[PDB]
Design a protein around this ligand. Sequence first.
Ligand SMILES: *[C@H](CS(=O)(=O)NOCc1ccccc1)[C@H](CCc1ccccc1)NC(=O)[C@H](Cc1ccccc1)NC(=O)N1CCN(C)CC1
Length: 254
Amino acid sequence: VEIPSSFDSRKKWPRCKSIATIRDQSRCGSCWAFGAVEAMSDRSCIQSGGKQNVELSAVDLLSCCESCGLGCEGGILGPAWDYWVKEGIVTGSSKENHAGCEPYPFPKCEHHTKGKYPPCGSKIYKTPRCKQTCQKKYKTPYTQDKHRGKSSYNVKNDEKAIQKEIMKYGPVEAGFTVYEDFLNYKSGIYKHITGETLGGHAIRIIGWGVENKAPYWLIANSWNEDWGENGYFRIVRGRDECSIESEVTAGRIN
Ligand SMILES: *[C@H](CS(=O)(=O)NOCc1ccccc1)[C@H](CCc1ccccc1)NC(=O)[C@H](Cc1ccccc1)NC(=O)N1CCN(C)CC1
């Protein structure tokens, strides 16, 4: 199939509201779990033809996966997708929406940026306990509410492979290196110019494009809609910028 110069998963599958959803990790290094459950929500809607249109629970994955790392202190992308395949993940919304089996326990906050929510600040919440019980008003049994993948995999470190993967099966999760200057992103096509290495971040790549011939990936962040470009950012595409093409992970429901 031919690779178009631009592609946006929202435009290909507008019936799948999750693709346009911007989540908030709050004061927790749960990015690894957010990029996973977000892409899994998108893919479940895409690949099921809408029979599974759910918002999967970040807290179920964050709190219960034992092979996924350190919870709010950082996690591992491959095992997150394997957990979805082997154990499954229940439904759950933001704290503010208080919907689904296991809604997120932590409130929206601003991630080194201006807006109406309280600043996230420096403190990191303790990883929630693995409870495996739905909220009181949610009447579907926890075990019955589990949504499972069929397979998971790493995507090849190759721009065209990543493009084809997205177009065919939907958004992917990806890891990239956070340098200091990323925390001051407001708009544009990000690349590392200044600042030392801080750590890594895990996000959802939903498409790609070009601006004045400069290629980029279109990424949904998990720092709420006030951050960046309405919750999204763009980053240089095709030069493994901040290792953005090096840790791409996804999976399928069928
Ligand atoms: C999610 C990133 S974030 O919380 O939104 N913060 O943005 C990056 C940042 C900024 C300042 C300092 C450090 C990082 C989390 C943050 C985890 C964390 C780091 C430092 C202090 C508290 C919490 N990042 C991860 O979960 C990353 C994901 C990733 C994997 C591979 C390649 C790129 C990204 N993974 C980790 O941080 N892990 C991996 C597993 N080990 C066992 C723990 C650390």
